[PDB]
Design a protein around this motif. Sequence first.
Motif, PDB file in Angstrom:
ATOM      1  N   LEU A   1      -4.198  -7.262   4.808  1.00  0.00           N
ATOM      2  CA  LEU A   1      -3.355  -6.993   3.644  1.00  0.00           C
ATOM      3  C   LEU A   1      -2.311  -5.964   4.062  1.00  0.00           C
ATOM      4  O   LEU A   1      -2.529  -4.755   3.970  1.00  0.00           O
ATOM      5  CB  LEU A   1      -4.193  -6.504   2.469  1.00  0.00           C
ATOM      6  CG  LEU A   1      -5.072  -7.547   1.779  1.00  0.00           C
ATOM      7  CD1 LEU A   1      -6.135  -6.875   0.926  1.00  0.00           C
ATOM      8  CD2 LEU A   1      -4.219  -8.473   0.934  1.00  0.00           C
TER       9      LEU A   1
ATOM     10  N   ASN B   1       6.317  -2.032   1.168  1.00  0.00           N
ATOM     11  CA  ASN B   1       7.039  -1.676  -0.042  1.00  0.00           C
ATOM     12  C   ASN B   1       8.474  -2.186   0.023  1.00  0.00           C
ATOM     13  O   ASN B   1       9.076  -2.250   1.100  1.00  0.00           O
ATOM     14  CB  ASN B   1       6.976  -0.160  -0.289  1.00  0.00           C
ATOM     15  CG  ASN B   1       7.652   0.663   0.801  1.00  0.00           C
ATOM     16  OD1 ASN B   1       8.291   0.137   1.706  1.00  0.00           O
ATOM     17  ND2 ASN B   1       7.477   1.975   0.725  1.00  0.00           N
TER      18      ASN B   1
ATOM     19  N   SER C   1      11.843  -1.338  -1.685  1.00  0.00           N
ATOM     20  CA  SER C   1      12.669  -0.430  -2.480  1.00  0.00           C
ATOM     21  C   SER C   1      11.856   0.195  -3.614  1.00  0.00           C
ATOM     22  O   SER C   1      12.227   0.148  -4.787  1.00  0.00           O
ATOM     23  CB  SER C   1      13.909  -1.148  -3.019  1.00  0.00           C
ATOM     24  OG  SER C   1      14.767  -1.545  -1.964  1.00  0.00           O
ATOM     25  N   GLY C   2      10.724   0.785  -3.238  1.00  0.00           N
ATOM     26  CA  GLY C   2       9.840   1.394  -4.211  1.00  0.00           C
ATOM     27  C   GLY C   2       8.371   1.097  -3.995  1.00  0.00           C
ATOM     28  O   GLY C   2       7.811   1.436  -2.948  1.00  0.00           O
ATOM     29  N   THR C   3       7.735   0.472  -4.983  1.00  0.00           N
ATOM     30  CA  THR C   3       6.297   0.253  -4.937  1.00  0.00           C
ATOM     31  C   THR C   3       5.926  -0.733  -3.831  1.00  0.00           C
ATOM     32  O   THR C   3       6.758  -1.496  -3.330  1.00  0.00           O
ATOM     33  CB  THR C   3       5.789  -0.255  -6.287  1.00  0.00           C
ATOM     34  OG1 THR C   3       4.357  -0.310  -6.272  1.00  0.00           O
ATOM     35  CG2 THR C   3       6.347  -1.639  -6.579  1.00  0.00           C
ATOM     36  N   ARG C   4       4.652  -0.708  -3.455  1.00  0.00           N
ATOM     37  CA  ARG C   4       4.135  -1.475  -2.332  1.00  0.00           C
ATOM     38  C   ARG C   4       3.351  -2.688  -2.821  1.00  0.00           C
ATOM     39  O   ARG C   4       2.907  -2.750  -3.970  1.00  0.00           O
ATOM     40  CB  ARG C   4       3.243  -0.601  -1.441  1.00  0.00           C
ATOM     41  CG  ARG C   4       3.735   0.832  -1.302  1.00  0.00           C
ATOM     42  CD  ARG C   4       2.788   1.683  -0.469  1.00  0.00           C
ATOM     43  NE  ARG C   4       1.474   1.820  -1.084  1.00  0.00           N
ATOM     44  CZ  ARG C   4       0.419   2.354  -0.484  1.00  0.00           C
ATOM     45  NH1 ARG C   4       0.489   2.821   0.751  1.00  0.00           N
ATOM     46  NH2 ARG C   4      -0.736   2.422  -1.141  1.00  0.00           N
ATOM     47  N   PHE C   5       3.193  -3.659  -1.923  1.00  0.00           N
ATOM     48  CA  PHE C   5       2.435  -4.870  -2.209  1.00  0.00           C
ATOM     49  C   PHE C   5       1.687  -5.291  -0.953  1.00  0.00           C
ATOM     50  O   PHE C   5       2.111  -5.010   0.171  1.00  0.00           O
ATOM     51  CB  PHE C   5       3.344  -6.007  -2.695  1.00  0.00           C
ATOM     52  CG  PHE C   5       4.111  -5.682  -3.945  1.00  0.00           C
ATOM     53  CD1 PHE C   5       3.549  -5.896  -5.193  1.00  0.00           C
ATOM     54  CD2 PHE C   5       5.393  -5.164  -3.875  1.00  0.00           C
ATOM     55  CE1 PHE C   5       4.250  -5.602  -6.346  1.00  0.00           C
ATOM     56  CE2 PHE C   5       6.100  -4.868  -5.024  1.00  0.00           C
ATOM     57  CZ  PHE C   5       5.526  -5.087  -6.262  1.00  0.00           C
ATOM     58  N   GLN C   6       0.561  -5.974  -1.157  1.00  0.00           N
ATOM     59  CA  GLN C   6      -0.281  -6.446  -0.067  1.00  0.00           C
ATOM     60  C   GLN C   6      -0.679  -7.892  -0.320  1.00  0.00           C
ATOM     61  O   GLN C   6      -1.023  -8.260  -1.447  1.00  0.00           O
ATOM     62  CB  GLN C   6      -1.541  -5.581   0.089  1.00  0.00           C
ATOM     63  CG  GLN C   6      -1.274  -4.093   0.246  1.00  0.00           C
ATOM     64  CD  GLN C   6      -1.141  -3.383  -1.088  1.00  0.00           C
ATOM     65  OE1 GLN C   6      -1.620  -3.870  -2.112  1.00  0.00           O
ATOM     66  NE2 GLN C   6      -0.485  -2.229  -1.084  1.00  0.00           N
TER      67      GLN C   6
ATOM     68  N   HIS D   1       7.747  -2.431  10.723  1.00  0.00           N
ATOM     69  CA  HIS D   1       7.953  -1.015  11.016  1.00  0.00           C
ATOM     70  C   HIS D   1       6.628  -0.441  11.502  1.00  0.00           C
ATOM     71  O   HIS D   1       5.830   0.072  10.704  1.00  0.00           O
ATOM     72  CB  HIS D   1       8.472  -0.261   9.794  1.00  0.00           C
ATOM     73  CG  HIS D   1       9.876  -0.617   9.415  1.00  0.00           C
ATOM     74  ND1 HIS D   1      10.225  -1.860   8.933  1.00  0.00           N
ATOM     75  CD2 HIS D   1      11.020   0.108   9.445  1.00  0.00           C
ATOM     76  CE1 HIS D   1      11.522  -1.886   8.684  1.00  0.00           C
ATOM     77  NE2 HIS D   1      12.028  -0.704   8.987  1.00  0.00           N
TER      78      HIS D   1
ATOM     79  N   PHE E   1       9.924  -3.298   5.199  1.00  0.00           N
ATOM     80  CA  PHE E   1      10.924  -2.917   4.211  1.00  0.00           C
ATOM     81  C   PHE E   1      12.012  -3.981   4.129  1.00  0.00           C
ATOM     82  O   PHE E   1      12.628  -4.331   5.141  1.00  0.00           O
ATOM     83  CB  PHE E   1      11.533  -1.560   4.561  1.00  0.00           C
ATOM     84  CG  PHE E   1      12.318  -0.939   3.441  1.00  0.00           C
ATOM     85  CD1 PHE E   1      11.682  -0.512   2.286  1.00  0.00           C
ATOM     86  CD2 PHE E   1      13.688  -0.772   3.546  1.00  0.00           C
ATOM     87  CE1 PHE E   1      12.400   0.064   1.255  1.00  0.00           C
ATOM     88  CE2 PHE E   1      14.412  -0.196   2.518  1.00  0.00           C
ATOM     89  CZ  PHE E   1      13.766   0.222   1.371  1.00  0.00           C
TER      90      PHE E   1
ATOM     91  N   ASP F   1      14.512  -3.713   1.565  1.00  0.00           N
ATOM     92  CA  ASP F   1      15.629  -3.127   0.820  1.00  0.00           C
ATOM     93  C   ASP F   1      15.990  -3.972  -0.397  1.00  0.00           C
ATOM     94  O   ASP F   1      17.156  -4.060  -0.785  1.00  0.00           O
ATOM     95  CB  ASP F   1      16.856  -2.920   1.715  1.00  0.00           C
ATOM     96  CG  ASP F   1      17.705  -1.740   1.279  1.00  0.00           C
ATOM     97  OD1 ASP F   1      17.769  -1.464   0.063  1.00  0.00           O
ATOM     98  OD2 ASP F   1      18.310  -1.086   2.156  1.00  0.00           O
ATOM     99  N   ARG F   2      14.988  -4.601  -1.005  1.00  0.00           N
ATOM    100  CA  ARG F   2      15.168  -5.446  -2.174  1.00  0.00           C
ATOM    101  C   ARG F   2      14.335  -4.904  -3.327  1.00  0.00           C
ATOM    102  O   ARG F   2      13.291  -4.281  -3.117  1.00  0.00           O
ATOM    103  CB  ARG F   2      14.769  -6.897  -1.880  1.00  0.00           C
ATOM    104  CG  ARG F   2      15.411  -7.511  -0.639  1.00  0.00           C
ATOM    105  CD  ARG F   2      16.925  -7.642  -0.768  1.00  0.00           C
ATOM    106  NE  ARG F   2      17.642  -6.566  -0.097  1.00  0.00           N
ATOM    107  CZ  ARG F   2      18.958  -6.402  -0.143  1.00  0.00           C
ATOM    108  NH1 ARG F   2      19.734  -7.223  -0.830  1.00  0.00           N
ATOM    109  NH2 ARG F   2      19.507  -5.385   0.516  1.00  0.00           N
TER     110      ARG F   2
END
Lengths: 100, 100, 50
Positions: B3, B7, B9-14, B38, B45, B47-48
């Motif tokens: 997982l 993130n 442009s803010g919050t993260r997801f897995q 990264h 990232f 940037d969306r």
Amino acid sequence: DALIVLNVSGTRFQTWQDTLERYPDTLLGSSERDFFYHPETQQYFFDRDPDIFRHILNFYRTGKLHYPRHECISAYDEELAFFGLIPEIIGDCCYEEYKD
Amino acid sequence: DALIVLNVSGTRFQTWQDTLERYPDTLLGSSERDFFYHPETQQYFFDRDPDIFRHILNFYRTGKLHYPRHECISAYDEELAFFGLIPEIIGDCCYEEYKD
Amino acid sequence: DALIVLNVSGTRFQTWQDTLERYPDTLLGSSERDFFYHPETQQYFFDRDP
């Protein structure tokens, strides 16, 4: 190549220096962000509504801003006045519906 | 698999690697995900904005995507273009709503 | 008095055992949550729309 983590009364976001500081006319592109910077936690705290700031982030990402449909105007107006944004660059269709 | 905590442009997801790879012809499926890798921060990232990324991840979850009625179409098609996503796959009812 | 942190494909939430397990008929109130539990990270991962 460095990007900073800035939090706005809760949810935080990741921004590059060039993207955030390409519009020096607005307070975001000026040095006043260092006033809101907190080096004690390595965070830039603005303490504002964390939904219109997302729209401002998208605007700086693309150069064009859009108006949320469920955030009304007497909540949008206060945020755009506090953040010093220009209300005449907010999209084309979004500009019309916001004016209406 | 793993997982990946990324993130946008803010919050993260897995989400699982294979589920991401179910669409290899897209930007996320192909090696462009490695281009957004990264290793210093173990994230991807884009940037969306996370809002449209939620619908994009819902698309990568199944064979169908949905378009919310509130947000403007311009940012949505911009996100579709940046992710390399085809526009004639966005559900059927949501497809015709986006069409009108 | 304990509450668990459960994440659903990203954003996580904090739930008490009694609140989440008061409806055993649904899959949430059953033991299948332990199937979605990940003790390696002390998180309950569902991987759905948040």
